[PDB]
């Protein structure tokens, strides 16, 4: 499994709005992360017959991200403010050319006003291991060490790209401090996890 790492800047922040009062999500779901990658190849088409969103075929690109600064949550329509901050994204899955060419062209993470940016990337080969230290968020059934104090429970969606259809409800644990927003590390003893560039990743 090849992989690519990328560093990102954000001009003002991301403002993904919860579906179903307009609360907002603390950290963007992977659906936005894969749509930002699909933007590179599917520019110009806002609707293609599957009708639904054009990024209905990029559902096998499993990848994650995490923050590397301090941010705030605001409601004035839930939003997250982290101007001039950093965001690291790890793509782990098509050949290296696809990832390294779609990844250098990443724009507009989230809403149209939630402009994003790409700083630098790198490429390599990943390795699979099953006690590792990670930072990126993961699913709910993943097991954590004896201490549990800095975890938030969030609801996310899987097969919901088709408009007019409801996304699947899945719980996902983000190791996050609610106020102020930051990321905290957690050793994991699970069955399915991946190591990438020293920074270990946990999946299930």
């Amino acid at each position: 499994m090849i992989y690519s790492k990328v560093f990102l800047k954000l001009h003002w922040g991301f403002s993904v709005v919860k579906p179903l009062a307009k609360p907002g999500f603390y950290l963007p779901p992977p659906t936005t992360l894969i749509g930002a990658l699909s933007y590179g190849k599917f520019r110009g088409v806002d609707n293609i017959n599957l009708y639904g969103s054009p990024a209905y075929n990029f559902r096998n690109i499993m990848a994650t991200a995490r923050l590397e600064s301090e941010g705030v949550y605001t409601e004035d329509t839930g939003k997250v403010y982290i101007p001039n901050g950093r965001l690291v994204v790890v793509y782990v899955t098509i050949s290296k050319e696809e990832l390294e060419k779609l990844c250098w062209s990443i724009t507009r993470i989230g809403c149209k006003e939630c402009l994003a940016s790409v700083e630098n990337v790198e490429v390599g080969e990943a390795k699979k291991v099953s006690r590792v230290k990670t930072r990126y968020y993961f699913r709910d059934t993943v097991k954590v060490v004896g201490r549990k104090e800095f975890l938030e429970y969030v609801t996310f969606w899987e097969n919901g790209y088709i408009w007019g259809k409801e996304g699947s409800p899945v719980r996902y644990i983000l190791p996050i401090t609610t106020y102020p927003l930051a990321s905290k590390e957690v050793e994991v003893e699970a069955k399915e996890a991946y190591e990438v560039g020293g920074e270990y990743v946990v999946f299930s």
């Binding site: 001009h11 003002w12 004035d76 001039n84 390294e100 250098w104 006003e113 790409v118």
Partner: protein, 317 residues
């Protein structure tokens, strides 16, 4: 496409108000955390939303298109950007709702031939057969630049009185002064191109003829935004805006320059533009820089003076 990042300086302004309490009208602010040796400090800084910028840009485009002889919707000429969203707007305008999915394209082009703003601005009609369209200009929030260890922004209240001869007349207004920066993108290559997949429908040749004029008008509409013709309360509170720095990249591949929140954002964006061009096999990459605060630039750029030359060079290429 075209991308840009701009740094402004505004004093004594009230350009975005919020819900009023009592006799006081309040400004819009956002929380930011500043790092200190002792710890962290949470502060509130005045901001300007992007909806006002979008409204100003759309109004300027409406005026330019009307002056240049292009179709404009009946409800759009009245500075009411409701757009062809509900059934009543179509009933007023005189457009038939889409029949099914396969004919959806037929609808879209028709809407594109009655209202130019329904193309650059983009529309979203709801109903049993929804149709989608994305704005061809993307704008971000106008926020102060978090530079160094201090925030150069403020917010005070002002007390105003109405005079009368038979007293039986007091209000308060919030005023601010900050250092605003914001960035934008414009994808001119997708102008007049239908965005619904399917077979071609008769009526695209006129769009081919009108592509040049529509692109020219869309580029011209940037002058209003870059000259400071947005916001509210301008009748009595007229702000004193000024331009400090600006970087604009003309490319042929997706790209976004770095934000102007650091004291050096021109050199780094040049370096990453070169790297991105090398990676993505790019043949078109030009940089336009306006500098008034005397920050470092680098090499490989064209030095401009004002905003008009920027629009001229954007139109030419």
């Amino acid at each position: 496409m075209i991308s840009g990042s701009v740094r402004f300086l505004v004093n004594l302004e009230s350009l975005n108000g919020v819900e009023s309490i009592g006799n006081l009208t309040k400004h819009r602010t956002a929380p930011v955390v500043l790092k200190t040796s002792t710890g962290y400090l949470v502060r509130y800084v005045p901001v300007i939303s992007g909806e006002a910028l979008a409204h100003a840009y759309q109004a300027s485009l409406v005026d330019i298109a009307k002056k240049e002889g292009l179709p404009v919707g009946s409800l759009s000429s009245q500075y009411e950007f409701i757009k062809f969203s509900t059934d009543e707007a179509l009933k007023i305008e005189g457009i038939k709702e889409p029949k099914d999915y396969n004919d959806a394209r037929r609808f879209e082009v028709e809407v594109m031939l009655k209202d130019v703003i329904a193309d650059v601005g983009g529309f979203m009609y709801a109903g049993g057969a929804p149709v989608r369209r994305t704005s061809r200009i993307k704008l971000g929030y106008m926020i102060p630049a978090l530079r160094g260890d201090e925030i150069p922004a403020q917010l005070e209240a002002q007390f105003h009185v109405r005079f009368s001869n038979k007293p039986v007349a007091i209000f308060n207004v919030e005023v601010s002064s900050a250092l605003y920066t914001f960035s934008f993108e414009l994808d001119e290559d997708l102008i007049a191109v239908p965005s619904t997949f399917g077979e071609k429908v008769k009526g695209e040749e006129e769009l081919e003829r009108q592509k040049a004029k529509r692109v020219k008008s869309a580029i011209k509409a940037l002058y209003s935004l870059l000259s400071g013709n947005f916001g509210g309360k301008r009748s009595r509170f007229l702000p004193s805006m000024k331009l400090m720095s600006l970087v604009v990249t003309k490319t042929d591949f997706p790209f976004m320059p770095e934000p102007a929140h650091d004291d050096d954002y021109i050199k780094t964006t040049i370096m990453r533009l070169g790297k991105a061009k090398g990676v993505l096999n790019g043949n078109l990459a030009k940089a336009y820089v306006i500098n008034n605060e005397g920050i470092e630039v680098g090499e490989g750029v064209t030095v401009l003076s004002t905003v008009e030359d920027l629009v001229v060079k954007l139109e030419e290429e």
